[PDB]
Short mmCIF file of C-alpha atoms in Angstrom, two decimals:
data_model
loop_
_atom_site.label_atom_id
_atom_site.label_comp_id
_atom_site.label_asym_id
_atom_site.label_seq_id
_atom_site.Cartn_x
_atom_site.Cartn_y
_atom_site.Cartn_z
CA UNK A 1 -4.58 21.62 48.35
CA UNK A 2 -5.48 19.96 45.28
CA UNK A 3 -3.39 18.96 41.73
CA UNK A 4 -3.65 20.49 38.22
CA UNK A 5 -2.23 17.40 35.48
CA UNK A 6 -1.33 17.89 32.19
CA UNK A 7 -1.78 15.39 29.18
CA UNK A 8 -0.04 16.06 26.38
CA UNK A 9 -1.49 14.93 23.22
CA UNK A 10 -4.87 14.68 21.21
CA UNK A 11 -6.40 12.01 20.21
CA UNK A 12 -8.40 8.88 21.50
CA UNK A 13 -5.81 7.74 23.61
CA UNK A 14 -5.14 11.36 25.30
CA UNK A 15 -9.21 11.62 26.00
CA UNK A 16 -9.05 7.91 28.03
CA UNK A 17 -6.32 9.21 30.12
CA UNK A 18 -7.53 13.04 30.70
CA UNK A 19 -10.65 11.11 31.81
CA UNK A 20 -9.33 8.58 33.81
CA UNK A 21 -6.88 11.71 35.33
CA UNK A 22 -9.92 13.79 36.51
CA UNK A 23 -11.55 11.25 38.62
CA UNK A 24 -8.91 11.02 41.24
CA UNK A 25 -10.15 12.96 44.28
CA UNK A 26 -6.43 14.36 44.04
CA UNK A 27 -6.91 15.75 41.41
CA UNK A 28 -9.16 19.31 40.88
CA UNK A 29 -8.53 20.26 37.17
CA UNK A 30 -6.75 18.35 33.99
CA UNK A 31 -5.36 20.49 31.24
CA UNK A 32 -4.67 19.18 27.89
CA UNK A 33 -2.45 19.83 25.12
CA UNK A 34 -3.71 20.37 22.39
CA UNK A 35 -6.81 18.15 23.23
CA UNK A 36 -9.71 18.00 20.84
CA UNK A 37 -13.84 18.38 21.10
CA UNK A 38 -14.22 15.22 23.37
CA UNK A 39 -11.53 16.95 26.14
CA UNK A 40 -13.18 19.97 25.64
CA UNK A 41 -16.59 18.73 26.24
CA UNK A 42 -15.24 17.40 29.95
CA UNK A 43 -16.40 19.36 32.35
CA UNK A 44 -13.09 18.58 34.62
CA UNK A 45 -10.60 18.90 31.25
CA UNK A 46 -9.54 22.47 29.35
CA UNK A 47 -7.89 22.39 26.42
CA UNK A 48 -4.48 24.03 25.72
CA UNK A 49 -3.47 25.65 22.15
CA UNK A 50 0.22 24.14 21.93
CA UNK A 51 1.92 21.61 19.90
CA UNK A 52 3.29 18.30 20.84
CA UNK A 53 7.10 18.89 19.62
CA UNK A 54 6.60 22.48 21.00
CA UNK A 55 8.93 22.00 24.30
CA UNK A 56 9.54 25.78 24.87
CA UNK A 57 5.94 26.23 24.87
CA UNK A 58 4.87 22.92 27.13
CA UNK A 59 7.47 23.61 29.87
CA UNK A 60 6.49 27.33 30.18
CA UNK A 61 2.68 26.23 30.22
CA UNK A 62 3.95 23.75 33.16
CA UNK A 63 6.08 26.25 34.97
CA UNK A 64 3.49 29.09 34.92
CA UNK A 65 0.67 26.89 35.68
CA UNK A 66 2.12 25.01 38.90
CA UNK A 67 1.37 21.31 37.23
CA UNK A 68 1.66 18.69 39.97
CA UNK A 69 2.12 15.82 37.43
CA UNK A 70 2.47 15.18 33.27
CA UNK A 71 1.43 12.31 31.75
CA UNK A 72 3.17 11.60 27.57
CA UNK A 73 0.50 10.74 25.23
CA UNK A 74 2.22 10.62 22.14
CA UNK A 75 5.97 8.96 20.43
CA UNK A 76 6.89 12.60 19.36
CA UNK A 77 7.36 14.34 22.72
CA UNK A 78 9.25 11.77 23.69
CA UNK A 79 11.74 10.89 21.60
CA UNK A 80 12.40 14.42 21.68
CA UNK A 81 13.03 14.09 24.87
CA UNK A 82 10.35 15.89 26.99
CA UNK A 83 10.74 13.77 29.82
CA UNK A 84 15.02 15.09 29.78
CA UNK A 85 13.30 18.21 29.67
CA UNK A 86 10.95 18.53 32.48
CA UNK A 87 13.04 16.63 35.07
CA UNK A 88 15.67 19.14 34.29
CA UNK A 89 13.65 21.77 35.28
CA UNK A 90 12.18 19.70 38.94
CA UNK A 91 8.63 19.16 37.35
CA UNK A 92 7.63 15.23 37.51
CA UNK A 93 6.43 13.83 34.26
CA UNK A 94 5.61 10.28 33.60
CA UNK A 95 7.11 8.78 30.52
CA UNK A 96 10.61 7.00 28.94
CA UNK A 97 13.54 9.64 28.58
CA UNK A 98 14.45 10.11 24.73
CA UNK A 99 17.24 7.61 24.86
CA UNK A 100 14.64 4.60 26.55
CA UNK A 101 11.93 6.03 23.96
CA UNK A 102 14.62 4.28 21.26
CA UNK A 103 12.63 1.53 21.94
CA UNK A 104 9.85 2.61 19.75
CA UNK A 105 11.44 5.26 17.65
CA UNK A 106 14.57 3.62 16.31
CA UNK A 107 14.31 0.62 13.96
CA UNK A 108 17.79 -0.44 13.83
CA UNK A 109 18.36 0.18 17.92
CA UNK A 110 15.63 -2.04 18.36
CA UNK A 111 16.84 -5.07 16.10
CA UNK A 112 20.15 -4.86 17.97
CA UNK A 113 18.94 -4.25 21.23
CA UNK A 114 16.71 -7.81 20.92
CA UNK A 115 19.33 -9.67 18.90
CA UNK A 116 21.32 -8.71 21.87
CA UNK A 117 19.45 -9.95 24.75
CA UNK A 118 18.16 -12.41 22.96
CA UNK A 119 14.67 -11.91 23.33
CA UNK A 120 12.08 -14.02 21.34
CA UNK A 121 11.08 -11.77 18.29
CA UNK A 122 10.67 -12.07 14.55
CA UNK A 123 13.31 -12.37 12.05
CA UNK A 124 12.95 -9.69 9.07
CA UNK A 125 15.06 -7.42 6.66
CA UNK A 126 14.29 -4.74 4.30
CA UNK A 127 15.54 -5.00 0.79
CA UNK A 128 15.29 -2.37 -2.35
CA UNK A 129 16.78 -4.54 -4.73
CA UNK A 130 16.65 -8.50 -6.03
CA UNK A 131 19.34 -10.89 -5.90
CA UNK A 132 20.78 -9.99 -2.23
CA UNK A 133 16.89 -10.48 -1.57
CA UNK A 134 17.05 -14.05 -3.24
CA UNK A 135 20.40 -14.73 -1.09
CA UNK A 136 18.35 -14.12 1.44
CA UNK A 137 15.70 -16.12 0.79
CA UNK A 138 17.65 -19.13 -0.03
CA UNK A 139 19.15 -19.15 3.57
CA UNK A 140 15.89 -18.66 5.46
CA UNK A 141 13.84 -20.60 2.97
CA UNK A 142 9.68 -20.93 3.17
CA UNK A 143 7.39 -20.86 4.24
CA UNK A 144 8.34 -16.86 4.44
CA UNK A 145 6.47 -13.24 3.84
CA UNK A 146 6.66 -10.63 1.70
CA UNK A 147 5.18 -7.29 2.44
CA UNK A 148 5.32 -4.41 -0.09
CA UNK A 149 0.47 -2.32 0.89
CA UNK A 150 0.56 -6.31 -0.55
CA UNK A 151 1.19 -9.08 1.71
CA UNK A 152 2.47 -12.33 0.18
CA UNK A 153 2.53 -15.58 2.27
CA UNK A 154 4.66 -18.29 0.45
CA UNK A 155 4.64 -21.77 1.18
CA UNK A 156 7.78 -22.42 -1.45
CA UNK A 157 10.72 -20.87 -2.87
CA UNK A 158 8.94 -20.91 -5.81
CA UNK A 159 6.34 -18.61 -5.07
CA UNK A 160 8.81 -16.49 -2.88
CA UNK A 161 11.08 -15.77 -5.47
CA UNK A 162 8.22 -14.80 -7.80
CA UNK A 163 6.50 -11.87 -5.41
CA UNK A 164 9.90 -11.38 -3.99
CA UNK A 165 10.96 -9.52 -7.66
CA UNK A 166 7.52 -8.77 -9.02
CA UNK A 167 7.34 -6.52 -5.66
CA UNK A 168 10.43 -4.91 -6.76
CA UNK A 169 10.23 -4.89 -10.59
CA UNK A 170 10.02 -1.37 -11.69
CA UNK A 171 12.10 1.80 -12.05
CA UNK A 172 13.89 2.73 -8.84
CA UNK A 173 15.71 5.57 -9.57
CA UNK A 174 14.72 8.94 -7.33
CA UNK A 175 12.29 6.65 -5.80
CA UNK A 176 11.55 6.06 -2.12
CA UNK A 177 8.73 3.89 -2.10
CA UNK A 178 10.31 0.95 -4.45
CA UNK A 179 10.83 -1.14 -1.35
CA UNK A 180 9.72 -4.26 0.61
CA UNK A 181 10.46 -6.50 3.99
CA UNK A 182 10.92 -10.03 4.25
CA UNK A 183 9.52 -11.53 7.28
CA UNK A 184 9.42 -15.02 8.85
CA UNK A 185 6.32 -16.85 8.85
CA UNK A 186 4.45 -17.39 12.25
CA UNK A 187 1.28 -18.99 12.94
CA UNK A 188 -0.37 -17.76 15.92
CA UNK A 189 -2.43 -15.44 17.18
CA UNK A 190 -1.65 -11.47 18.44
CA UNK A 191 -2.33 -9.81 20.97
CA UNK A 192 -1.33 -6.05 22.99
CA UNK A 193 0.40 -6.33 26.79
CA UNK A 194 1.05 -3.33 28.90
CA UNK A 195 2.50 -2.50 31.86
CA UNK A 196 3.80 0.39 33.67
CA UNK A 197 7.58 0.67 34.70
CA UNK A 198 9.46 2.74 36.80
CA UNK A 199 12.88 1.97 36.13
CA UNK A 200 13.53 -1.11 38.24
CA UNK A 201 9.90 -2.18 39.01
CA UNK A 202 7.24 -3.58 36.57
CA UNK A 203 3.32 -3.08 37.43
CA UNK A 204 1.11 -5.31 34.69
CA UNK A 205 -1.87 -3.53 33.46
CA UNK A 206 -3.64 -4.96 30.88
CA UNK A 207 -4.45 -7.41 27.74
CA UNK A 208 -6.13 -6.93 24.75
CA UNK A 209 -6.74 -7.89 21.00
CA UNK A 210 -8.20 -5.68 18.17
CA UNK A 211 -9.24 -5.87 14.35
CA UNK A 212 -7.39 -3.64 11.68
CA UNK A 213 -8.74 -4.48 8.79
CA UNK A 214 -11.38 -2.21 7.62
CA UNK A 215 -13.82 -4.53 6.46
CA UNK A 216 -16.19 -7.20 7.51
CA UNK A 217 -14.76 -10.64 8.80
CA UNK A 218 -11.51 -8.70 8.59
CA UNK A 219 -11.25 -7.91 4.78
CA UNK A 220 -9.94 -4.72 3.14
CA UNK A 221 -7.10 -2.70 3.58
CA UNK A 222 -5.14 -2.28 7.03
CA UNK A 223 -6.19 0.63 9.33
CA UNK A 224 -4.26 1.78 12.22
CA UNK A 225 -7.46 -0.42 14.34
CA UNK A 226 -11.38 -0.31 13.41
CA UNK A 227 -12.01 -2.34 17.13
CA UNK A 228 -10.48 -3.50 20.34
CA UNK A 229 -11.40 -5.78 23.13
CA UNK A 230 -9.61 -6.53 26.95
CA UNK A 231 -8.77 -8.69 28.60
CA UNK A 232 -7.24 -10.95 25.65
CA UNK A 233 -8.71 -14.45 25.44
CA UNK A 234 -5.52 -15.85 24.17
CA UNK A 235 -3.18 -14.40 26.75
CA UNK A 236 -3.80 -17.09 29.52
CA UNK A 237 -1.74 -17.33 32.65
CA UNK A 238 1.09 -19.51 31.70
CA UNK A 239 1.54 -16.95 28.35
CA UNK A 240 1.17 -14.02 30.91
CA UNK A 241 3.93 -15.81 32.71
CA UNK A 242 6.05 -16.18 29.94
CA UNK A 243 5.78 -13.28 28.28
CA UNK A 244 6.92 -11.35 31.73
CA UNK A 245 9.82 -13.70 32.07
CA UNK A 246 11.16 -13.90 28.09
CA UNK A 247 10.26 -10.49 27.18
CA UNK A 248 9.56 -7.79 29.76
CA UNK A 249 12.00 -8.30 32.75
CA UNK A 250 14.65 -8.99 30.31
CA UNK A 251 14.11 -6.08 28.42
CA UNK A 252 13.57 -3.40 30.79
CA UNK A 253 16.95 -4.69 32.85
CA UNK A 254 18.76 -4.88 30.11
CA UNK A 255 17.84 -1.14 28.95
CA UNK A 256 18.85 -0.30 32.48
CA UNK A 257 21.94 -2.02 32.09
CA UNK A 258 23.11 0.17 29.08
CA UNK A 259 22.75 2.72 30.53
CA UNK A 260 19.11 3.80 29.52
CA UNK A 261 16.80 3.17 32.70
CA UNK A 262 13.09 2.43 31.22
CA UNK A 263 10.14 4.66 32.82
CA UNK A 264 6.85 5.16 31.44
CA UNK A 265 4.23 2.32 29.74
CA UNK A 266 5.43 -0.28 28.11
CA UNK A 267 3.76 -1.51 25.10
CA UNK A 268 4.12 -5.00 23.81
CA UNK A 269 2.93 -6.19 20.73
CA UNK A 270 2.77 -10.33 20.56
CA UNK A 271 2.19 -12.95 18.26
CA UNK A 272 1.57 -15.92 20.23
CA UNK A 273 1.66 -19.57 18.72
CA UNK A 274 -0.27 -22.65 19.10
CA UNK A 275 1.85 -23.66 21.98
CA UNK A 276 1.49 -20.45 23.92
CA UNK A 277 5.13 -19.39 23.09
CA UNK A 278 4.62 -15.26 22.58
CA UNK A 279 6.85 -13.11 20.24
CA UNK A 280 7.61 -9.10 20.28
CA UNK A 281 6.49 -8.24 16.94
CA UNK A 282 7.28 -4.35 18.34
CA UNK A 283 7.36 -1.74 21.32
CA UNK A 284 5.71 1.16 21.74
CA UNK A 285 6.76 3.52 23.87
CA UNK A 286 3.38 4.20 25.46
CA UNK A 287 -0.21 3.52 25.34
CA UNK A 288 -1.68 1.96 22.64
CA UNK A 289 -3.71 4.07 20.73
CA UNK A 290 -6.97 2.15 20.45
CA UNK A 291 -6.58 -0.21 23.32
CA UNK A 292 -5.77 2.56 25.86
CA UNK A 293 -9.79 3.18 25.13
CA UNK A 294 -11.48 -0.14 26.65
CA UNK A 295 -8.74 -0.55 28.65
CA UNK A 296 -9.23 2.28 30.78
CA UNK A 297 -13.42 1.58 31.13
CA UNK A 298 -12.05 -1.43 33.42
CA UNK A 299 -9.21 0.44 35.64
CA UNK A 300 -10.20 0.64 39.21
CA UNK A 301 -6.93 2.01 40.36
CA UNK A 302 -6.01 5.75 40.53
CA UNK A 303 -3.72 6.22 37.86
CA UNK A 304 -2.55 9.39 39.12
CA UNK A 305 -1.89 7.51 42.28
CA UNK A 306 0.30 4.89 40.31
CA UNK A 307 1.84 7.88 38.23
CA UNK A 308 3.72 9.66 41.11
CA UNK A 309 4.56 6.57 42.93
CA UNK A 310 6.59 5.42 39.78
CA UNK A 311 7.95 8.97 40.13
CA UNK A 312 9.18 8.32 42.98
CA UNK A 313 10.29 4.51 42.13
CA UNK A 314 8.21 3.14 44.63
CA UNK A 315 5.74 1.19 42.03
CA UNK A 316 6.32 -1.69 43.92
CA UNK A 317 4.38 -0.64 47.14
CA UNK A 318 1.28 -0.67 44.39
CA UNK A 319 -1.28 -3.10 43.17
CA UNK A 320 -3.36 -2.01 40.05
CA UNK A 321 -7.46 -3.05 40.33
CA UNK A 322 -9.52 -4.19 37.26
CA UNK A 323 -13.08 -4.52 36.62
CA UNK A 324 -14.24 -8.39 36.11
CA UNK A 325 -16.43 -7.70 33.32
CA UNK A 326 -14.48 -7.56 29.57
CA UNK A 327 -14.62 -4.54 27.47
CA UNK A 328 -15.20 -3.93 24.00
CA UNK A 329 -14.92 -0.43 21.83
CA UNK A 330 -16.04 0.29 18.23
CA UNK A 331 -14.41 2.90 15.76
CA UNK A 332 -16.99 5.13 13.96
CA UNK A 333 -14.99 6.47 10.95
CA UNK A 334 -14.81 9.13 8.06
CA UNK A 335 -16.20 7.08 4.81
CA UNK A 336 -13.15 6.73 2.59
CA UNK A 337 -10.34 6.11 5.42
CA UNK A 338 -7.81 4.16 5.20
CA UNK A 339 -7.49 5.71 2.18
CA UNK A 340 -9.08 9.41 1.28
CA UNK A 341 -12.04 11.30 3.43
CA UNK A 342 -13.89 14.36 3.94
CA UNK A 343 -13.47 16.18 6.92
CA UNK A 344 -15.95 19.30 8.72
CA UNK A 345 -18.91 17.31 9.15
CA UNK A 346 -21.74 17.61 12.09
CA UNK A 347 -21.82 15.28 14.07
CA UNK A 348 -25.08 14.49 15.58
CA UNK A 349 -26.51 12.50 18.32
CA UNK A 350 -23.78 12.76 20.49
CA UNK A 351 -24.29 11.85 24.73
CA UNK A 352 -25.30 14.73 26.85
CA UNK A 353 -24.36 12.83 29.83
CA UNK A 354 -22.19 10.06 30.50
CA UNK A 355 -23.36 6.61 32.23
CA UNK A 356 -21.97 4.33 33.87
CA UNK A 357 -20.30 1.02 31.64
CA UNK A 358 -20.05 2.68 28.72
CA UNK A 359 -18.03 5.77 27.22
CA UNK A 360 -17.88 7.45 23.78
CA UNK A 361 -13.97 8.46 23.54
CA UNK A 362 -13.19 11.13 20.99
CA UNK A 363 -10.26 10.84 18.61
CA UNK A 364 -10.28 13.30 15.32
CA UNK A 365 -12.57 16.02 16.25
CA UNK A 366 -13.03 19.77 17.18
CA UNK A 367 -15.11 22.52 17.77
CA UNK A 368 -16.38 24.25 14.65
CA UNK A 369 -20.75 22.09 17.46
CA UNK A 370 -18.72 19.03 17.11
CA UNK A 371 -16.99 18.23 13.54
CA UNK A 372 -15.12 15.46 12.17
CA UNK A 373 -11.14 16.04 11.82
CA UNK A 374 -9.44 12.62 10.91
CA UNK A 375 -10.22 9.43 9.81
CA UNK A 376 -10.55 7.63 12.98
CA UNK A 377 -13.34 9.87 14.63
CA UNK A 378 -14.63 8.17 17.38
CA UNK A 379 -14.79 5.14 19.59
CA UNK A 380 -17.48 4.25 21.93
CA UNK A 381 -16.93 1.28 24.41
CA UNK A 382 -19.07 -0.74 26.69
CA UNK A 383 -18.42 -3.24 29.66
CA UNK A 384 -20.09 -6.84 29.64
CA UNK A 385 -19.47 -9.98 31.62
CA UNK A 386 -19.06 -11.74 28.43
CA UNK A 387 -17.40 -9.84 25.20
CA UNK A 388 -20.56 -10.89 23.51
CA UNK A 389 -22.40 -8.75 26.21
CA UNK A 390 -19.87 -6.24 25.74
CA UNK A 391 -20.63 -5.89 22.05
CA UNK A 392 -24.20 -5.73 22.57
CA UNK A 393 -23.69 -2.80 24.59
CA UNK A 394 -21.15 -1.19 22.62
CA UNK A 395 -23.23 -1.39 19.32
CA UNK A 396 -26.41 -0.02 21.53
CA UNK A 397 -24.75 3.03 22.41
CA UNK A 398 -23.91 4.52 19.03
CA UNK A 399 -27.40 4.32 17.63
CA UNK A 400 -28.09 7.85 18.09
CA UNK A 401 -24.50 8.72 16.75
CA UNK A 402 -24.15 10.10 12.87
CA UNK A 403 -22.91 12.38 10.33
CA UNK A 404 -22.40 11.75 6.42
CA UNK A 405 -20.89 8.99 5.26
CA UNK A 406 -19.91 7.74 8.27
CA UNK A 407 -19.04 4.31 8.74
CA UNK A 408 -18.09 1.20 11.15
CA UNK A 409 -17.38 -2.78 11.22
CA UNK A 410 -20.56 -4.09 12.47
CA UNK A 411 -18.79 -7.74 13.75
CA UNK A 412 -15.91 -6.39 16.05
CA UNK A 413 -15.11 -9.51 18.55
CA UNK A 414 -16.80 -12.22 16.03
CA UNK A 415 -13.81 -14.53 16.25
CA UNK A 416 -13.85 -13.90 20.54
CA UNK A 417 -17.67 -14.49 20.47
CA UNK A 418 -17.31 -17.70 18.97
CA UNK A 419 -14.59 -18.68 20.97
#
């Protein structure tokens, strides 16, 4: 008759897919593990009380349950190899096996694995103490970076040398977090590309760009992303070109080459220069977290469709459909965050009914109604045929939307809007 899915996760990214899940005509109900008060509020989704790392507990929920399909969320399930798990056991999950999930979830195995292949990325190392730091420096010379929390762009030696040990000057005995990363300077612009992959096949999603600095004009401290638009501006088709041919097909034949076939999304972030020329800055083993938000308002396709033909490594017989107009979501957040923040507050003014171009995606809440629970609480997104019209939209649905000390950038897509 119909299917039952499971999406394991629960947060913003979990909510865009559960959503997107339940409106396949496939499909009759979409369970969610561990979900949170957006999932819950779906009339097609029901939340399920079991953890992410708890494999026991997600295959026997699978098993007893009959689920047609499972879609990964989140990097923990999968580097601990849920997808090993499940296809062990005959059910048909879609996401990277833990050894392809090494991608994301080991540092060195990724430095090696691009060094290897030769793939245009960025050169860095990590360093605890001065002088092989200097040594360093003297053989890459500046301009160059220095990240601690503090990010130091140097255009000489000079002023290299200087952050390079004031960074590190301190007591470093029994202590972790005296260290810092040396990183080559680039001058572009980034950007986010997905795809989906089913081993030997690669089906392009989407583009986007986002803001992660918490304040105004992009000032502040770094957040994990206050805003997010699609499709990106910057990624035009001779980068989309390149970026397939330098970076993606090279990568995902030369995991299956090594014996560690690559299924599941495919996350690329870029940094792509004047020229056009784009860079992996890193891989992520699955959605985006913020992106996966606006990204999803404009899929046209049925992703459960494009799910089991991967499955099935037949992603090639499939075309994936997008909505013409751009897309644009804002993060409403915990007052405090990145740093310290209150959680357990009402949240008020929430939709009773969703409409069509826009959605308000839920990240860290639950049921108490609705409460905050993290420090990214909610994103609501809007389509436009301009991103300017987008953010009109977007800012025009969360007017009814508060609780205390809740807070928000008020100019996400400024630099887009002006072009």
């Amino acid at each position: 008759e119909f299917m039952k899915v499971l999406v394991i996760g629960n947060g913003g990214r979990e909510h865009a897919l559960a959503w997107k899940a339940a409106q396949s005509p496939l499909v009759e109900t979409v369970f969610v593990a561990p979900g949170n008060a957006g999932t819950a509020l779906e009339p097609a989704l029901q939340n399920v009380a079991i953890g992410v790392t708890d494999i026991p507990a997600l295959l026997d929920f699978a098993q007893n349950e009959k689920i047609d399909l499972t879609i990964v969320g989140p990097e923990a399930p999968l580097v601990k190899g849920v997808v090993d798990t499940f296809r062990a056991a005959g059910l048909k999950i879609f996401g990277p096996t833990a050894g392809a999930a090494q991608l994301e979830g080991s540092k060195a195995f990724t430095k090696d694995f691009l060094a290897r292949h030769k793939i245009p990325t960025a050169e860095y190392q990590n360093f605890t103490e001065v002088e092989p730091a200097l040594a360093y420096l003297r053989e890459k010379g500046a301009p160059i970076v220095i990240k601690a929390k503090g990010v130091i762009v140097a255009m000489t030696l000079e002023e290299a040398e200087a952050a390079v040990h004031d960074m590190l000057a301190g007591n470093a005995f029994g202590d972790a977090g005296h260290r810092i990363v040396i990183e080559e300077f680039l001058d572009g612009e980034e950007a986010s590309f997905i795809v989906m992959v089913d081993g030997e096949h690669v089906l392009p999603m989407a583009t986007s760009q986002d803001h992660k600095r918490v304040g105004d004009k992009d000032t502040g401290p770094n957040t994990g992303g206050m805003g997010a638009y699609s499709p990106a501006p910057v990624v035009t088709d001779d980068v989309h070109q390149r970026t397939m041919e330098r970076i993606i097909w090279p990568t995902v034949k030369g995991m299956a080459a090594e014996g560690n076939t690559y299924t599941g999304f495919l996350y690329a972030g870029l940094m792509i220069d004047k020229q056009g020329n784009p860079k992996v800055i890193e891989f992520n083993c699955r959605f985006g977290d913020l992106e996966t938000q606006p990204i999803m308002l404009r899929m046209k396709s049925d992703l459960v469709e494009l799910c089991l033909a991967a499955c099935e490594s037949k992603l090639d017989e499939k075309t994936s459909e997008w909505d013409e107009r751009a897309s644009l979501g804002v993060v409403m957040a915990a007052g405090g965050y990145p740093g310290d923040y209150r959680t357990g507050d009402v949240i008020h003014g929430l939709p009773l009914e969703e409409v069509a171009g826009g959605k308000v995606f839920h990240a860290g809440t639950k049921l108490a109604q609705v409460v905050t629970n993290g420090g990214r609480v909610l994103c609501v997104t809007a389509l436009g045929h301009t991103v300017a019209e987008a953010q009109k939209r977007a800012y025009a649905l969360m007017t009814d939307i508060h609780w205390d000390d809740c807070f928000c950038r008020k100019d996400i897509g400024w630099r887009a809007i002006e072009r």
